[PDB]
mmCIF file of C-alpha atoms in Angstrom:
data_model
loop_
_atom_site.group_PDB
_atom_site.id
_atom_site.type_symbol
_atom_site.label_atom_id
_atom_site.label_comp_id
_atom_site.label_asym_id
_atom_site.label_seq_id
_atom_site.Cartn_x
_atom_site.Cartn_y
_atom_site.Cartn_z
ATOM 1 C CA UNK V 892 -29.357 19.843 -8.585
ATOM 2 C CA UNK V 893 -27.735 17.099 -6.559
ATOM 3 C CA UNK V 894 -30.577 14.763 -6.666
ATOM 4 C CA UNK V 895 -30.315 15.178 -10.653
ATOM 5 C CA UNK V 896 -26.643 14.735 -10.559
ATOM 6 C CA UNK V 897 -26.845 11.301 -9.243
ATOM 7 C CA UNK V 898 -30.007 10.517 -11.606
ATOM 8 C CA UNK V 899 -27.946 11.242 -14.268
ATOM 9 C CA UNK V 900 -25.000 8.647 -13.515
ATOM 10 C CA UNK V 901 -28.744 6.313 -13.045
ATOM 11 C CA UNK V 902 -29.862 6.822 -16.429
ATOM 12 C CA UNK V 903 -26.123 6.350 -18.172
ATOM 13 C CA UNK V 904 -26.169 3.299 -16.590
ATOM 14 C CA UNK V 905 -28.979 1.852 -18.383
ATOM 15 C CA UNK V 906 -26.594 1.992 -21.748
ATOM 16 C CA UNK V 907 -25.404 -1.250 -20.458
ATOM 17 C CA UNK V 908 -27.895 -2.986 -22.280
ATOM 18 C CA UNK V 909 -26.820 -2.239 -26.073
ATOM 19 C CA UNK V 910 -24.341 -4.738 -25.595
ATOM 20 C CA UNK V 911 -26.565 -7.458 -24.358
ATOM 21 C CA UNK V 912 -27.552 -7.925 -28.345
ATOM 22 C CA UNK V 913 -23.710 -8.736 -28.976
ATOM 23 C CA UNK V 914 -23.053 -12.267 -29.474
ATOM 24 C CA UNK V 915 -20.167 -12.135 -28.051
ATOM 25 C CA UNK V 916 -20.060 -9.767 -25.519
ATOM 26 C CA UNK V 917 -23.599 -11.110 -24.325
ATOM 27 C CA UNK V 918 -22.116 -13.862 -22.359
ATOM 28 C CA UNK V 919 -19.879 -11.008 -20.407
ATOM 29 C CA UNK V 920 -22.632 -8.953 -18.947
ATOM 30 C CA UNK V 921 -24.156 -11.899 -17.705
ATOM 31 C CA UNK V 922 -21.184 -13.464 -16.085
ATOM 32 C CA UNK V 923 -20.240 -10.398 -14.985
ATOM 33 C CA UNK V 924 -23.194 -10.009 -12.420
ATOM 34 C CA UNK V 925 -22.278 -13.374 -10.680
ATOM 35 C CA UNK V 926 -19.565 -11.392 -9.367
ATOM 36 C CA UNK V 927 -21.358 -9.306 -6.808
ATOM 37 C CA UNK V 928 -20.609 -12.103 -3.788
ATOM 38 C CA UNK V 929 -17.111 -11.864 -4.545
ATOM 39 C CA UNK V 930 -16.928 -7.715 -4.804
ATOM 40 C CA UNK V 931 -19.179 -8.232 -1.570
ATOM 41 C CA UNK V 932 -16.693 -10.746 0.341
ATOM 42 C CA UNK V 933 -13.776 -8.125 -0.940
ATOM 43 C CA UNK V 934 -15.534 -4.998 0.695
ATOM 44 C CA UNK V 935 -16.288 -6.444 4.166
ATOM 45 C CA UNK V 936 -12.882 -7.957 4.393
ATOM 46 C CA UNK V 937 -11.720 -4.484 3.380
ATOM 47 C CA UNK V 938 -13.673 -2.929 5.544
ATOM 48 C CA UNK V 939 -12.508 -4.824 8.647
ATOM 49 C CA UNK V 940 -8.725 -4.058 7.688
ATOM 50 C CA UNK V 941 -9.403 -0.191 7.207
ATOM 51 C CA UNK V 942 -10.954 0.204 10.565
ATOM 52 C CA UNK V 943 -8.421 -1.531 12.226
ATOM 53 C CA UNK V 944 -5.127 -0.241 10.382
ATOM 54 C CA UNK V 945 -6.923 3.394 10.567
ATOM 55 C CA UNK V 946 -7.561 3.636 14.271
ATOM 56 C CA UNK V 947 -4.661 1.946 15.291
ATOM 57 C CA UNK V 948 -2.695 4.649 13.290
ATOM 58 C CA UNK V 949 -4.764 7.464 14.249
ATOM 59 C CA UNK V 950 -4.650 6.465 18.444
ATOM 60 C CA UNK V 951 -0.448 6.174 17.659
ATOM 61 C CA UNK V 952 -0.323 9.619 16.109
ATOM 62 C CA UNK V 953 -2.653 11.407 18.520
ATOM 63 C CA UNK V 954 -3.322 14.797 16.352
ATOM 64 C CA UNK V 955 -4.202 17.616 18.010
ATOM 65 C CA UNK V 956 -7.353 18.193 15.530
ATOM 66 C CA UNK V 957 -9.347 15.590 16.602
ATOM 67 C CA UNK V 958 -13.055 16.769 15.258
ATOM 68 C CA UNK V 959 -15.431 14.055 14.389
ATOM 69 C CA UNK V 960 -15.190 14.793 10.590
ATOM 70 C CA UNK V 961 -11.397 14.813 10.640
ATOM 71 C CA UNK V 962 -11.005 11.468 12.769
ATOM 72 C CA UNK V 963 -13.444 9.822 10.299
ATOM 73 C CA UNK V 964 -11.557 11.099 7.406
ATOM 74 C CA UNK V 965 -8.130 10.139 8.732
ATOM 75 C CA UNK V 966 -9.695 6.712 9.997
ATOM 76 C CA UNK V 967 -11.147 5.838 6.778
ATOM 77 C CA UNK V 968 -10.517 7.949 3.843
ATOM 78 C CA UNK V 969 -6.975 8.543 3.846
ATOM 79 C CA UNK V 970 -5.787 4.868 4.244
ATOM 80 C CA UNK V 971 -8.403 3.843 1.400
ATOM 81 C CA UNK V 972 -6.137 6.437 -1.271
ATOM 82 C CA UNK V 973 -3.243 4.572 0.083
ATOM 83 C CA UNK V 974 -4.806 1.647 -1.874
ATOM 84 C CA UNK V 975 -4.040 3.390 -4.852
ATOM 85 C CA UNK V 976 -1.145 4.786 -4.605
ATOM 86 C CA UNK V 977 -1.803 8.038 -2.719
ATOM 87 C CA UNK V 978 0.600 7.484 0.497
ATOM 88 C CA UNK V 979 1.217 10.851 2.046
ATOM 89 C CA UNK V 980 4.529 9.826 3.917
ATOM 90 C CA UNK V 981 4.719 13.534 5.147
ATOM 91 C CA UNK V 982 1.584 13.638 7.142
ATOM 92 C CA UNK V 983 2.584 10.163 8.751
ATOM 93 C CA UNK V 984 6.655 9.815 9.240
ATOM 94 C CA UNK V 985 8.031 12.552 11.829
ATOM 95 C CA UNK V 986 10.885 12.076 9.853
ATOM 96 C CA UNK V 987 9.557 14.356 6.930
ATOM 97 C CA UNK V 988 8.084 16.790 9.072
ATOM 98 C CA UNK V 989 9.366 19.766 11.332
ATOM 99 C CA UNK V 990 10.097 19.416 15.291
ATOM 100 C CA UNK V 991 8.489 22.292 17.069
ATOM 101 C CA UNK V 992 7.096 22.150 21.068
ATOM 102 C CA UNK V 993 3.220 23.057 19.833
ATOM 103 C CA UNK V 994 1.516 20.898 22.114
ATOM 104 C CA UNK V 995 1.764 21.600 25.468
ATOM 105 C CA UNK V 996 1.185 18.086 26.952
ATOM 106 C CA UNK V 997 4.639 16.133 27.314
ATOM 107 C CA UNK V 998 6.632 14.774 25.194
ATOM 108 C CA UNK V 999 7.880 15.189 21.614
ATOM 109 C CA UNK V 1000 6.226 16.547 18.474
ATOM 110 C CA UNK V 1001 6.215 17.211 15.257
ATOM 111 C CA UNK V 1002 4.033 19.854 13.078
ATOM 112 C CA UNK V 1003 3.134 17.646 9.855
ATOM 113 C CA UNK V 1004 1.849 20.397 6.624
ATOM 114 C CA UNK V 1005 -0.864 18.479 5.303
ATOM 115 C CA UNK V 1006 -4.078 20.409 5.709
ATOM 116 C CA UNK V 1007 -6.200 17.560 7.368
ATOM 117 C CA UNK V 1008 -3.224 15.812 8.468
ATOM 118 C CA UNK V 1009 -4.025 17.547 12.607
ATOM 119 C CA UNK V 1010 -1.617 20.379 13.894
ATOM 120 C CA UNK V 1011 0.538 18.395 15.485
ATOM 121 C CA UNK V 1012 1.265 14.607 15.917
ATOM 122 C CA UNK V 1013 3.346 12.643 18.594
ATOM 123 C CA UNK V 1014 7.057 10.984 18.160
ATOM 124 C CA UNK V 1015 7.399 8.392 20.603
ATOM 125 C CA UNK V 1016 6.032 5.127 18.397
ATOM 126 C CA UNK V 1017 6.452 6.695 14.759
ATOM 127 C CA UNK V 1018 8.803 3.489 13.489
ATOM 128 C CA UNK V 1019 5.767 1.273 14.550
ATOM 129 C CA UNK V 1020 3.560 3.895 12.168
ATOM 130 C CA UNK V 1021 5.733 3.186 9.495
ATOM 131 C CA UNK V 1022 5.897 -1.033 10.334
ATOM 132 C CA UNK V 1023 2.058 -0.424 10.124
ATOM 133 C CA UNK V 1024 2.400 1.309 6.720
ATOM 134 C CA UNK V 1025 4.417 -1.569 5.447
ATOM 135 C CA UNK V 1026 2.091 -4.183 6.550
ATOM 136 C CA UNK V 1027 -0.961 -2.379 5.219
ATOM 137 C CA UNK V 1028 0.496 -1.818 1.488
ATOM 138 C CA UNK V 1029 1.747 -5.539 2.006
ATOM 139 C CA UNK V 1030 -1.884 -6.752 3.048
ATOM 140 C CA UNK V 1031 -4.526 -4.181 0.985
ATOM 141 C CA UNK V 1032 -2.320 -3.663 -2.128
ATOM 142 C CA UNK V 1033 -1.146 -6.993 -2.989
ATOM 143 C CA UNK V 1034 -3.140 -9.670 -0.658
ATOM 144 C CA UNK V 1035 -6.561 -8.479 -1.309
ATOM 145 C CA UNK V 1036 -6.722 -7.564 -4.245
ATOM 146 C CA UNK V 1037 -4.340 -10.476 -6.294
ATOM 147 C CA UNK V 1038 -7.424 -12.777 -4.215
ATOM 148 C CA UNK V 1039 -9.945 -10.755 -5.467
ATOM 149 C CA UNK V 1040 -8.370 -11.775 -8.738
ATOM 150 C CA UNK V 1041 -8.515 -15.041 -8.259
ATOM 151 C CA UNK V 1042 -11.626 -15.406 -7.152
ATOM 152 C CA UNK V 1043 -13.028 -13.394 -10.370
ATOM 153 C CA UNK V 1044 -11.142 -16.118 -11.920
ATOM 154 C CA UNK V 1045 -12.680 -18.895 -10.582
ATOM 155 C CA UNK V 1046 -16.457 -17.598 -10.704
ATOM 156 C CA UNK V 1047 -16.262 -16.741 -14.106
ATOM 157 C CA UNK V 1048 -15.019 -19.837 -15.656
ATOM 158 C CA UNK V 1049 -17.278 -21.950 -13.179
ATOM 159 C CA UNK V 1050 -20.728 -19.758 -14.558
ATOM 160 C CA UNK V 1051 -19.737 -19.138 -18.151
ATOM 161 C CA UNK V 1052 -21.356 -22.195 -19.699
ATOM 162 C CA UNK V 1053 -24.908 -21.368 -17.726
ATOM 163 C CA UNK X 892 -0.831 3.197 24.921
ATOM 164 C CA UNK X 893 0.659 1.946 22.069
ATOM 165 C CA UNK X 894 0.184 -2.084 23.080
ATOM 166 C CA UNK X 895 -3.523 -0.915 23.214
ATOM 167 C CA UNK X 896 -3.372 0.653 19.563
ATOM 168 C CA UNK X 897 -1.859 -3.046 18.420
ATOM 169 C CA UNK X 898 -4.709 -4.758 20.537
ATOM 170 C CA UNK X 899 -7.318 -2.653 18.676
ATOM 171 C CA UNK X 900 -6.176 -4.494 15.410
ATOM 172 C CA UNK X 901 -5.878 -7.676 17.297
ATOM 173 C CA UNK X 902 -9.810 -6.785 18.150
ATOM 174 C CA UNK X 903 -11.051 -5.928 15.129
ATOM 175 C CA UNK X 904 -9.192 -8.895 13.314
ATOM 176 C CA UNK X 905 -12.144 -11.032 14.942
ATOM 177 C CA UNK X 906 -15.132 -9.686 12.818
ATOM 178 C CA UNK X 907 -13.770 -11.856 10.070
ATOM 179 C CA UNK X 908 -15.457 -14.857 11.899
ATOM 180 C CA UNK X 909 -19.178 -13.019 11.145
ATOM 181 C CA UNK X 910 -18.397 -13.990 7.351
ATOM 182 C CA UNK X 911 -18.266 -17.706 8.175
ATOM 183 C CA UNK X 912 -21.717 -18.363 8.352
ATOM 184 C CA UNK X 913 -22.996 -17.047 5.138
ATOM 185 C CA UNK X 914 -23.308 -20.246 2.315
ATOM 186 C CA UNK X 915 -21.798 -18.396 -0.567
ATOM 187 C CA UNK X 916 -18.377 -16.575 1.114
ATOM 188 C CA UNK X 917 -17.914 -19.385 4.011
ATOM 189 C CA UNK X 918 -15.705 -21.598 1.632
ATOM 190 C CA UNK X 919 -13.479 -18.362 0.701
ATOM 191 C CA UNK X 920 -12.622 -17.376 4.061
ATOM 192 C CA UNK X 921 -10.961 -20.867 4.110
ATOM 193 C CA UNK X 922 -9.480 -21.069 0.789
ATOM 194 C CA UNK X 923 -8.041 -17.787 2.038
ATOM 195 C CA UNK X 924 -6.398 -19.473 4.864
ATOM 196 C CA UNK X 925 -4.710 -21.810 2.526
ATOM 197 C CA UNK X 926 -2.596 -18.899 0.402
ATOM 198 C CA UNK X 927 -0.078 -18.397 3.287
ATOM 199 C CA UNK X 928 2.571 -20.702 1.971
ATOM 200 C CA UNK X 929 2.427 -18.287 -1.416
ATOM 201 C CA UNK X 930 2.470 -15.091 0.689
ATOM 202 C CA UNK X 931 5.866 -16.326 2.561
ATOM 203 C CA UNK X 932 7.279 -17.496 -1.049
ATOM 204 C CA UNK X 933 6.872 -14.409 -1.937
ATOM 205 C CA UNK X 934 8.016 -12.614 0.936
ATOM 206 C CA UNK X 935 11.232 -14.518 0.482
ATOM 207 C CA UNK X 936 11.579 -13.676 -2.791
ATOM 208 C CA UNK X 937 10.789 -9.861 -2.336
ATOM 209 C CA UNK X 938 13.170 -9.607 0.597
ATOM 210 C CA UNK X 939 15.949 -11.070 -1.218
ATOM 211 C CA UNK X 940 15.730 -8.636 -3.548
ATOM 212 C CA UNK X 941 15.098 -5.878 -1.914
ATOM 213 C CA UNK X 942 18.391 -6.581 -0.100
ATOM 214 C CA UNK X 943 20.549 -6.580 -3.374
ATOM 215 C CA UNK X 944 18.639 -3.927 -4.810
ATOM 216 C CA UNK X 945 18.742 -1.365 -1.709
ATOM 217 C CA UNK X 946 22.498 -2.343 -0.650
ATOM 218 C CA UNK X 947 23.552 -2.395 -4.504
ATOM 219 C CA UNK X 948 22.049 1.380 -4.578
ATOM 220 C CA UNK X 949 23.175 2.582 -1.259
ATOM 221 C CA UNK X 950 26.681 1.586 -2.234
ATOM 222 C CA UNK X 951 26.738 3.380 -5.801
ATOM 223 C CA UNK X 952 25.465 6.934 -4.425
ATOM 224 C CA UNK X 953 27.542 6.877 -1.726
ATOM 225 C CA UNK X 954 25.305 9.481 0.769
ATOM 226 C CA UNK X 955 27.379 11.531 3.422
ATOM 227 C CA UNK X 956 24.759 11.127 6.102
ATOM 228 C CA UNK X 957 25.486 7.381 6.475
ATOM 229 C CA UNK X 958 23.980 6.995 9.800
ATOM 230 C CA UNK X 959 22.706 3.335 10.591
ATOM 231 C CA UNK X 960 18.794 4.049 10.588
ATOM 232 C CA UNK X 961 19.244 6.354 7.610
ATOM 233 C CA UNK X 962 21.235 3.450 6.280
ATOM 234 C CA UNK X 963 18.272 0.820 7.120
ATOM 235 C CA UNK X 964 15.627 3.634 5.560
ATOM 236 C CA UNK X 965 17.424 4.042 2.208
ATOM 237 C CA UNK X 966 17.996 0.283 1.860
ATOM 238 C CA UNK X 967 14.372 -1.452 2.609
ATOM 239 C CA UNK X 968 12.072 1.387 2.827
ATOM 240 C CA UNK X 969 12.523 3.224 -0.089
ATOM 241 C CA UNK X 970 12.518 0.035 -2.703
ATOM 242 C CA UNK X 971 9.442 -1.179 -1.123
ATOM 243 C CA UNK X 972 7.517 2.087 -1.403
ATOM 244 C CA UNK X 973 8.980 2.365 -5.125
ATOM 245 C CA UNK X 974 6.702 -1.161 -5.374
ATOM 246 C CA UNK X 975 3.941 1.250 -4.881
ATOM 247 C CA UNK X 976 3.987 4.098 -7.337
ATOM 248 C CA UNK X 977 6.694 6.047 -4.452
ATOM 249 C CA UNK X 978 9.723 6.536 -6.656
ATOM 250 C CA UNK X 979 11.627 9.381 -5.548
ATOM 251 C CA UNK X 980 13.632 10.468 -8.826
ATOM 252 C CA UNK X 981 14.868 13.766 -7.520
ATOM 253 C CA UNK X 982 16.688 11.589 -4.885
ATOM 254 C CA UNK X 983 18.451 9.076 -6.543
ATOM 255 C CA UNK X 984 18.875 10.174 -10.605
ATOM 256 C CA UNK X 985 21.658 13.177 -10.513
ATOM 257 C CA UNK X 986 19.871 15.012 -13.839
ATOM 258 C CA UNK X 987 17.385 16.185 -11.480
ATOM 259 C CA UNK X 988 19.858 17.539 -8.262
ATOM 260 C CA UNK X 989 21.302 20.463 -7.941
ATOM 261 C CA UNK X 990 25.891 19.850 -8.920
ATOM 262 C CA UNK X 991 27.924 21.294 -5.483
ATOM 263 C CA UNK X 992 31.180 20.637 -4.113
ATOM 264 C CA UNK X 993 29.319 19.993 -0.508
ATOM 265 C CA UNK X 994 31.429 16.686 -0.584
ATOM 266 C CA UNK X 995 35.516 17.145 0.787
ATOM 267 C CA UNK X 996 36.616 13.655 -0.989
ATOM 268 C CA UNK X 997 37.344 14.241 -4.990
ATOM 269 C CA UNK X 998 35.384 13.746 -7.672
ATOM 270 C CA UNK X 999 31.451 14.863 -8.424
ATOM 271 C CA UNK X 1000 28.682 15.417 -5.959
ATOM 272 C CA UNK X 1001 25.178 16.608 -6.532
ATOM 273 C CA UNK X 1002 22.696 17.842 -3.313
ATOM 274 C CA UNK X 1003 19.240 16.010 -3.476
ATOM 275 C CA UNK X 1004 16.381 17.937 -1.898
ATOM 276 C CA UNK X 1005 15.361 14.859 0.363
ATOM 277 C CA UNK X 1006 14.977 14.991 3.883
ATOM 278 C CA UNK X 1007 16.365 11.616 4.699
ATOM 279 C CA UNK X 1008 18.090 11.064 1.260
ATOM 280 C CA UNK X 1009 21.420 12.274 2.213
ATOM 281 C CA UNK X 1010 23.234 15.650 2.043
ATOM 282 C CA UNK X 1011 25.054 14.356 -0.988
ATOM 283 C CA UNK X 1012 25.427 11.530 -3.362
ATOM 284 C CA UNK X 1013 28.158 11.038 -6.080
ATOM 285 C CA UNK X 1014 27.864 11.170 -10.117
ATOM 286 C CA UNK X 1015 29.770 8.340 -11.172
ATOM 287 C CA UNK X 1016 27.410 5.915 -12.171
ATOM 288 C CA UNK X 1017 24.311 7.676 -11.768
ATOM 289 C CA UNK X 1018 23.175 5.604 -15.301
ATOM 290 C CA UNK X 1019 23.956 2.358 -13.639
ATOM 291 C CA UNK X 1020 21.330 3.754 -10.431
ATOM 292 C CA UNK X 1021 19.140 4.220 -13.284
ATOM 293 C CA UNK X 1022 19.054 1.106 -14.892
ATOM 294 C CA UNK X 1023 18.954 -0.989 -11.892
ATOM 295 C CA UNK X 1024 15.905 1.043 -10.806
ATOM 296 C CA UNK X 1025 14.453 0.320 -14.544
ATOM 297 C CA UNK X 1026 15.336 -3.848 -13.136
ATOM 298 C CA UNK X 1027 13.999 -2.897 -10.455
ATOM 299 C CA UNK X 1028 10.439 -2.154 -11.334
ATOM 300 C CA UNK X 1029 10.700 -4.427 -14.217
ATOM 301 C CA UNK X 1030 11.555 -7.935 -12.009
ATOM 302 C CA UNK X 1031 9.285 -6.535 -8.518
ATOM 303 C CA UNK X 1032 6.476 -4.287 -9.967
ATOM 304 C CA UNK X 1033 5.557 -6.983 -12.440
ATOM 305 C CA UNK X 1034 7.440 -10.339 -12.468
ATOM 306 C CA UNK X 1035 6.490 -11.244 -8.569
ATOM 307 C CA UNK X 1036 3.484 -9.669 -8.813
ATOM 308 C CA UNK X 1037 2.084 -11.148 -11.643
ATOM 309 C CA UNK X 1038 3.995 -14.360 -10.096
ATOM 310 C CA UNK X 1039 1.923 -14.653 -6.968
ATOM 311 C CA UNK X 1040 -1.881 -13.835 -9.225
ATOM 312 C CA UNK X 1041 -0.466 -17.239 -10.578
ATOM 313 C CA UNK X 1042 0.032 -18.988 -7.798
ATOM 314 C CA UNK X 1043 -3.211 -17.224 -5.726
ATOM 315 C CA UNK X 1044 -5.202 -18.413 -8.665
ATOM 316 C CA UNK X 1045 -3.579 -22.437 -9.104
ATOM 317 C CA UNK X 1046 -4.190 -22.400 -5.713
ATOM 318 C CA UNK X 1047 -8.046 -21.258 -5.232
ATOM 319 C CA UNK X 1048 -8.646 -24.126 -7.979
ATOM 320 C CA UNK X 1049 -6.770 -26.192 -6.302
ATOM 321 C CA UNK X 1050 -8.174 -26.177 -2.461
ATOM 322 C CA UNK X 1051 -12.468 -24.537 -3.192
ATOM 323 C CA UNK X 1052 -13.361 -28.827 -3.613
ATOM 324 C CA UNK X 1053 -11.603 -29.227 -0.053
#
């Protein structure tokens, strides 16, 4: 069932040539698949960001539920919703969360309610965490992707006329 | 710990130099280079008005817990998450509070259900909070924005020969 799943976003895929009989909208789809170095340049330089913003975050908030799954999920998943505008401030600022003595090593913490968010994260660097916040929605949401933009700019006037 | 968490970005900012030997994406990583002097324009410009935004909104609601970092929070942090789909109505438009005489001073006071949005806020001019939020996200969400695509893209044609 899985296996057919996928073939079936394969096959839809193929409608992608009605429109290569267009006059107009010929051109497009044929531009349009000059644009894989670009995408390609885009993901590794995403990529490199996401590792480092989500392991520096994840080392600086130290949760308690630190199973493979969950430390690739917080390393990688979460910060790649906060491209799109799926910031869970609760899970991150001990600001927004509840003070309570759950982990037994030293220091202070705070018991965050998200459900993959780890039982309990540390206090002592959490205004760097949110300097690190700021710099990733300043770097991913606006940097990246307004070059991206520019870039799919530039391509697609320079191959249009071939 | 911490200074190690920062020196796994400063790390991992180095695999940007694999990039630099392909033929196709070596010229972007240095037209990249060259879009600094539009990222600090725009920096400028976003901090500028993020001060007379934040201060302008901080004055009219008039919170009761005016303590300095709360006062820092609800002046820069809050405006630039609102840049990213983060606008927190229930904590600044009084329609959506619940009306209490918490405050001791005269006049009309409404308790917003934020943590760190004050105990709270007044209902005099909630309509003028309003509109400058509409400014807000009309001049930041899509004047700079929009602004700096311009500027990213004048600049890739202008530097790719180079």
């Amino acid at each position: 069932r899985t296996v057919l799943c996928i073939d079936f976003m394969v096959f839809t895929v193929r409608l992608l040539h009605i429109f290569t009989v267009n006059k107009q909208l010929g051109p497009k789809i044929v531009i349009v698949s000059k644009m894989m170095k670009d995408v390609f340049f885009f993901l590794f330089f995403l990529g490199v960001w996401l590792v480092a913003y989500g392991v520096a975050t994840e080392g600086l908030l130290r949760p308690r539920d630190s199973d493979f799954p969950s430390i690739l999920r917080r390393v990688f998943y979460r910060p790649y919703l906060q491209i799109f505008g799926q910031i869970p401030q609760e899970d991150m600022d001990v600001a927004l969360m509840e003070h309570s003595n759950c982990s037994s090593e030293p220091g202070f913490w705070a018991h965050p309610p998200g459900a993959q968010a780890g039982t309990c994260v540390s206090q002592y660097a959490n205004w760097l965490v949110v300097l690190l916040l700021v710099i990733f929605l300043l770097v991913a949401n606006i940097l990246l992707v307004n070059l991206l933009i520019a870039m799919f700019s530039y391509t697609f006037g320079k191959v249009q006329g071939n």
